[PDB]
């Protein structure tokens, strides 16, 4: 008469508390682990120019004059007008094509000798005081051309570590960007880039570099202290959140580990091989890097459809071992009026060449910290029965033993009574 | 929704509807081959906008 | 004898747990919603100069020579000494006042033709590849003078969207700041500004721009990639937190939606109309923009009292649908030595004019994310009775049914016993 | 027969819930307190040069010619070759040592008159409009040489406050870095610094400045708006987290309050006094600042062992009243083409001297906020018995009164039965 | 405390005390009109530092 | 572990093992005096790598 009227008050609170479980709510927890060892993040860096000017020949101009965006489709200097006299004299001399016999061409060979060698870009690599050198930089290939990578972790070299904060305990790279050997830009295209600097992306060792869409820039003539603070992320598998937590062999067709950057490159490789069996030089695989004349029919518009679709054509999900890197720039003008005539004498260069083509990166951890942000499921199964008993211990008083002995009550109802 | 992408099973975003397949969309002097997740169908000739899982084969 | 001694142990734990409710504690939850569509934030931008030099006339100098901070109160060139010869020749020629008859004046008309037109500031507006134009910029008025606004959302034009990350999928604005036509600064005042650059504030569509107190700066001669990461905030109404969550008509005397920026402008309009019935040109309302001679008596010191009070004179509270925008700058030197002689030929300008008066903004989303930080009440009313029953299920064992049937116990105490 | 079989189900859930207490898990809570008064953070600033060139004498060159890194160990100009003619003429004239009698030397006296005086560095200090002056800067000593400190809070001057946001309500310091009087760098050492700018660290009043390892940089010729947003941190004592929360007298051998920066200086003072009873001029204590010839035997390598150990030699823990300061830079080019000939006339300097040696800091609070991040223990002792009773109110139904009256049950078992 | 500001009801900050009204504080060649929240009264001629709600009318 | 540093008691990091004392490690034309927390012992002559609390006296 009233016990029926309190069971519905229990049934309403029990139904909302079992539906509160089916929301899969989650809270997040932020720590600051004062760690003692930290692995150095892999710094990559690309010049903003793709091919240097003083190291291209006649056959490179004959075979890829339109891919260089320098020549006419009927093989001439198209807008050779009011640019320069020293650039124009060397241009028509290496674009004569007067009985110039062609040669066997290979695009991967073209990028290995017409990009930017690190032996004349870099001037002084450092690490915590001990003198870094030139062969610590694993060469990589991405869309800006030839790009290098400090602290890669592959090809046998171990992952370097750091154990002290402060500006004196990281890289100190005095680069040189060589603005004289940029491409002449007397034409006009859609991909034209007037700038002159270095794009640098700081990432962990597992992701391949993606300078096109994640890297900042560093201007020449300005030493930029770039601090860091290593974050760690732990996301949850579905239906709590989203993970590709199954790491046996998810999508690693050309890599080993899974990452949101390596998804898009593996996407754009598998899409292009399904169109004309090509791949560009920044595309890992086994199908051949294809001929320059074949690039203009199939390989060019198949990828320029991708930058026009106005959606991410190939989707995927983030993993849940993500380690980002938060950064905080600052700038100090490098070629001082006290220090002008020493750098011009030492590196055997002009005076005005110093104030335009000298860059000093400086990357270091600020405080040896660890900012972990993880997701934890907030209403587990073991808290369900623990919170199903707060109200039945209050409303009716009945334990489940009163229901467990209610089975032993039923022996006197079906056997003895009927 | 967990339909295919060139031979790999891949889940879509939970906001995203039915996926599709296309040996078309010419767009240049070419005949493209597309396959992926989507949110709007335009079925004229081959845009198989099927809302079932693993439909693109 | 002991049941009285365990009820006080219940009463102490119950009193602290009902006072824990009256603290109104709240925890906060951070997500990363991997969204698929994102609305572009409304970029506004102001030059750091208020009135251009080559487009002021005699009557503008006669009527507002002291508001321009260029003339004497007895109508002369006050400190015309050792500034320039080309500036001084054109100055005294447009400040002769030899039988120069005055004209009807209007301050709103003065700011529409003596500010900075966007048709000669802007050179190339872009959006995801497709070519933006000049008439997408809604003109606004704030304290730096004439200011523009990309992606306003008002006046019929819809809110633009983006669906891809990376640097190639946002604005690419090659501005031009025209340092030649700044005001001559041979005088000295308290408002003197030696700088020359653009102030740019990124905000959502509902707040009016507030460049005076929230915008950063972008230097000329440096293309600055400005990343973004859209945040969402949900605050709680009082007494949990603070909101003006009642959005029927709170304070929208000249706007439609409520925001912490639009509070202060609506404050400073309603204060000044209660003093001398004026308003400046950056003040929305219906009272007339008042005469320049009337500005010097009433309108100038009534607002300069506001910057001297050493308190925010007009207070309000933040709303709880706030969407901020976190930013991360980076700089790359624009006018390259390869790209010098093309920009001077194309835009028909000098060589040294390029390296001083060319700015390239570049604003883009980094990863299509959504960092929501919301406040949730941590001890609701429905958790009070759920946690009032943990101890009485442990201390005394008594359910509330033992109190609910204690009413049926009272029938045998007042009716049958007495 | 079954009550024994449900007690083990209770005992498993009770053992995990008492071990969940011994994990000492903790969640963290983020607020945004819209405060009304905020204390201004103490800005320190150092030039990147240690000793000015035009204020060193013969005996300073005779006594510390090798510590200046300018002279030979056998007292000559070592690499006086192809640097300059004006620098080299004044160098050999103040390095003659032809019957130059020595003098009494003191290193603390050398740094007080050969550093950088603030009376000719600073040009215009401001604070909210009212004109700041030169004697508000408490002189401090750190590793870059002579350094100054705004808003120190010591030596009787109170802590200044601010009550409004925006760019017009903080410092506006038009500094001057004097690149002409830097040290000549025609030699080459390991500590060589080619740069020329100011390092500025924003910190609270209790920590001493630590410009070597925490400060950013500001380039000359660029006015940099530096925003701020005051954070507050509350960490927990062990075994929940880590604190030196006992603040009676923890390690304050030369200071009063405890901080992670003041730990390392107190470390490096107490280590060096245990080696040769010296201290450098940036080391607080009572032992004498020792002679320059004594620095070369003991004081130099004892500290250069510290920068080579590849570990933080002296460890400590963070306190739990930490107030950090998050920053967000932006740059605007200062010496405008309209404003060139006024600054050269006013400060009595050249034209090209303006565009190289003028810096304008500008530090201000953005919005008067308070981002507090505190740690709270998530499973206290008073929640243990509250959650030990959810299952025994569900599994067996037995309250602790059924165990409390089980003591009164035992009176009939040991007294009357046996 | 929820007193007025030129015809709009506006709550104060919870740290802030009594509000006020003033047809005074000359400060220049002028006679100002002020009204808002405050924390310190200086009642000489018209500074109605009343600590009641909606007092400034 | 809470061993000494030149006359001040200081706890180590919870990842860090036994601490030590050394009137050695010459490294230059000098004979250093070191004392602090550590994680690797190299006991040859005086490196007292004792894993007890307050051991360095
Ligand atoms: C992945 O995450 C788990 C859980 O945090 C961690 O234990 C494991 O070491 C991580 N694996 C890699 C390869 O980083
Ligand atoms: C130094 O530069 C000059 C100028 O071009 C050149 O002649 C000389 O060979 C250079 N020296 C070296 C070692 O490259
Ligand atoms: C305001 O916030 C509520 C709750 O988050 C949301 O549903 C609503 O769309 C928001 N309104 C506006 C106009 O943004
Ligand atoms: C280009 O600049 C020159 C130099 O002032 C000028 O005479 C000419 O009219 C300009 N051309 C155009 C189209 O404005
Ligand atoms: C230290 O922290 C406590 C707790 O937050 C606070 O009450 C106290 O004022 C702080 N002390 C100092 C000196 O900042
Ligand atoms: C101004 O500079 C000149 C150039 O050196 C100098 O002769 C003159 O004394 C300076 N004036 C003052 C007041 O210092």
Author numbering:
A (entry chain A), C (entry chain C), D (entry chain B): 48 to 465
B (entry chain D), E (entry chain F), F (entry chain E): 1 to 57
What does the paper say about this structure?
These channels are involved in diverse physiological processes, including learning and memory, neurodegeneration after ischemic stroke, and pain sensation. The trimeric hASIC1aΔC shows a canonical chalice-like architecture. The ECD resembles a hand-like architecture with the palm, knuckle, finger and thumb domains clenching a ‘ball’ of β strands.
We also report here the structure of the human ASIC1a channel in complex with the snake peptide toxin Mamba1 with resolution 3.90 Å, reflecting the toxin-inhibited state of the channel. The overall architecture of the hASIC1aΔC-Mamba1 complex shows a triskelion-like shape viewed down the threefold symmetry axis, with one Mamba1 molecule radiating from each hASIC1aΔC subunit. In the tip region of Finger-II, Arg28 is oriented toward the α5 helix of the thumb domain, thus becoming closer to Asp347 and Asp351. Phe352, a residue that is conserved in ASIC1 orthologues, is nestled within a hydrophobic cluster composed of Met25, Phe27, Leu32 and Leu33 in Finger-II of Mamba1, mediating a hydrophobic interaction between Mamba1 and hASIC1aΔC. The snake toxin peptide Mamba1 contacts Asp347, Asp351, and Phe352 located in the α5 helix of the thumb domain, causing these residues to flip outward from the acidic pocket. The α5 helix thus deviates by ~5° around the central axis, whereas the α4 helix and the finger domain adopt the same conformation as in the apo-hASIC1aΔC structure. In the TMD, TM1 undergoes a lateral pivot of ~6° around its carboxyl terminus upon Mamba1 binding. The transmembrane pore of the hASIC1aΔC-Mamba1 complex has a diameter less than 2.0 Å in the gate, indicating a closed channel.
